[PDB]
Amino acid sequence: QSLFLSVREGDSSVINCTYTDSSSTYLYWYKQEPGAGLQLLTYIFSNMDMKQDQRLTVLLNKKDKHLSLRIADTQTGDSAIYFCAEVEGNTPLVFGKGTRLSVIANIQNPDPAVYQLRDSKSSDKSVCLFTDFDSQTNVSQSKDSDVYITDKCVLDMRSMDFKSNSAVAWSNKSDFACA
Amino acid sequence: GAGVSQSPRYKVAKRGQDVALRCDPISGHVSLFWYQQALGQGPEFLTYFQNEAQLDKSGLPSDRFFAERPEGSVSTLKIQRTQQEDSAVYLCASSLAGLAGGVEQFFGPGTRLTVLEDLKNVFPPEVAVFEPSEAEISHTQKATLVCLATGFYPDHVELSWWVNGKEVHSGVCTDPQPLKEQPALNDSRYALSSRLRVSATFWQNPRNHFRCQVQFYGLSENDEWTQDRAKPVTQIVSAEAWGR
Amino acid sequence: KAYNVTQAF
Amino acid sequence: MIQRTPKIQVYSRHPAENGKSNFLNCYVSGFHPSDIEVDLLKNGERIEKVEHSDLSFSKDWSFYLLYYTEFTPTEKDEYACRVNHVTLSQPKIVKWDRDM
Amino acid sequence: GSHSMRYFYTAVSRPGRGEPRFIAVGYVDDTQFVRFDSDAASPRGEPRAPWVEQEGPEYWDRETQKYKRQAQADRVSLRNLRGYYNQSEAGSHTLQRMYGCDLGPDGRLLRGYDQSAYDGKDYIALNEDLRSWTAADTAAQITQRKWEAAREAEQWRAYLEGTCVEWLRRYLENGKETLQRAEHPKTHVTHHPVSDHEATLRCWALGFYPAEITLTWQRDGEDQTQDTELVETRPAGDGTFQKWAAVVVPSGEEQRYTCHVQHEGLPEPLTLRWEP
């Protein structure tokens, strides 16, 4: 997460990096989702110009030591951190700085509406849910010392190909305001 | 989790004690690598092995670190007198023979090692579930359950949703990163939120059961705990709810 | 510049 | 392993001129294995100060080395090279002859 | 004209006397430019030529780590080769590897090579096509399997066709004043009496580079080489080489013999006589 990149659903993403040693025989692309390990995406032999496999396209440009990954039809499942890695001979991978790819969900029918939920099991602390807002909608942190606002995550119900952004807020200072 | 295994996964250790991390690579693989990782930063090299031989150990930041691989299979990284600066994720990778493009390779899930000043700060999470709002069901015709885990420390929690004894993933999004309740406090406790969303027809059915599960990683059986509070050991805190 | 590191025999 | 006896040549870096400083060289080659003891001598004594080149080998896998030192050629000294190897019954001694 | 870079690796196991020793030297033609000895108190890659020292710490610390790892791999190789042949643990054994690239006068890779020996015996060699290996015995075939699984050949083709050529061209430019400046030999003829009627004519060639040379003796203009004495070309200890060729002639017939020399720095061959 040294660099950040935001792309809209269905578009294409392009990640870049400048690796170190021009003698690297193989360049690699790994992706790491929050909490998981590194997943191998692709590799390219340094003598090749470009390599393709499904929605991924790798473009190499030696001399400049420039490596690019293009994700076609980028979708929410692609949000992660992407790392460049190089290797030459019988040595360990050398990883570059990461790039966090953030996919903005396609919201067909915006319908912003804040709702208060039943604090099941008599939970004094209340919570109001900001949901159904637009991709351009923003959620910032109320400077109120004891009013917590969470970031925005997208939810995907595959049963009906429906998506929806969601946010949550609660107060422990005994002062709640759903508006 | 088919591939390389790493034993502790999560580990808390007080400044001064020792810790040992375990790696279980694929049986046939000749080479085995250890990396270190900070918050969302690129992995850095520690040491790697050819069969049982250690080709290089220059990555180790201190002499307290000691990796080994007795018979060329399992590897173990031991740390003595762990310091606050040792807090990080430790990754293991194994390959058939080197890392050339096309050679079989697998990275492990990793092990997050939090070195704490004192274990008196460890607290498991307190989970609660909030039922959907009839206002939401009256407009969106969808039902949104929200789960809220608070007061845990460190942030060693893994949350999930279970509908009628089944772990579901559709209609779920959990916070990417916990939220520190005491922004100014250094050792502040955290809080994590999550949501599960289904049709109003599923929440209305009172025969359905919804469970928010939170796996917390704290102390192990071999840990000095003297306070009269309950030992904050690794456990699962859950909060359930039923349709209406 | 030398070959990086050869594979073992 | 294979055994191969070393070839030896003792000579000077520059055409020897009595009085003028110069370099004394003992060049061993064609031997195998690589374990070998080479020592430069003056009147039978071992001159401790000796710099040897880095171990290397020829296309046929035979090693070669250059032990050398700085000396000032003066008559009635008799510099020589004593080389002992696994393939030698006893150290082979080769005296230096400025005519060669 | 035609240059080349060459590396020589030697690993010798010394049971009961420490870990195996690893030495590595690198040559550009006949000029050694790098050395690494695993037995030095501060084992690091040290420059041996005045056209590589201006590369910076990034370059030299990269070779040091490279060599330190290679020495660990060779220690693994010695154990593996030992186990392939069921060789005693109390025996000393030698591993040698030699590789490099010939930069043809075309300015491109003319050919790359990599070959190894165990106890002075050809073990495994990279083929000229840079795609496969040739194994001497059944043990080398085990090694071939392991290298085939590792795509070792693909990494050698990329190194020999890229890094090797790229850096050889860089070295030649940095040291053009010596690597590409051929140096003709300084020559003369000495006289040494054998018997009351015999004398030796020794033809000297001193201070030349590269080492390739040819000395010929001729009486009346023919190839009188059946009774000529040639010593192996030898180093002067400073970048130049030496070589002499002797012939025994009947006293009084000195001016019947002429010495012919051939070196790259000499535009036309040199015929030399003995000046009484």
Residue numbers in the entry:
A (entry chain D): 6 to 184
B (entry chain E): 1 to 244
C (entry chain C): 1 to 9
D (entry chain B): 0 to 99
E (entry chain A): 1 to 276
In the authors' words:
In the context of the HLA-A24-B52-C12 haplotype, prevalent in Japan, the KF9 peptide (N266-274: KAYNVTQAF) is immunodominant and restricted by HLA-C*12:02. We also determine the structure of a TCR in the context of the HLA-C*12:02-KF9 complex, providing a prototype for the interaction of HLA-C with viral peptides. KF9-specific T cells are cytotoxic and suppress viral replication of both the ancestral and multiple VOC SARS-CoV-2.
We solved the crystal structure of GV37 TCR in complex with HLA-C*12:02-KF9 at a resolution of 2.54 Å, with clear density for the KF9 peptide. Indeed, a Kd of ~6 μM was calculated for the GV37 TCR binding to the HLA-C*12:02-KF9 complex, which is in the upper range of CD8+ TCRs29. Overall, the GV37 TCR adopted a canonical diagonal docking mode onto the HLA-C*12:02-KF9 complex, with a total buried surface area (BSA) of 2,068 Å2 that is in the range for TCR-pHLA complexes. The TCRα chain contribution is slightly more (52%) than the β-chain (48%) to the TCR BSA, with the CDR3α having the largest contribution (24%), followed by the CDR3β (17.5%), CDR1α (16.5%), CDR2β (16%), framework β-chain (FWβ, 14%) from the flanking regions of the CDR2β, and CDR2α (9%). The peptide was mainly contacted by three CDR loops (CDR1α, CDR3α, and CDR2β). The CDR3α loop made most of the contacts with the peptide, with the loop stretching over the central part of the peptide and contacting from P4-Asn to P7-Gln. At the C-terminal part of the peptide, the major interaction from the TCR β-chain is made by Gln50 of the CDR2β loop with P7-Gln. The TCR Vβ chain binds to the HLA-C*12:02-KF9 complex with a 40° angle, while the Vα is perpendicular to the HLA. This docking angle favoured the interaction of the FWβ/CDR2β with the HLA α1-helix and seemed to push or “scoop” the CDR3β loop away from the peptide.
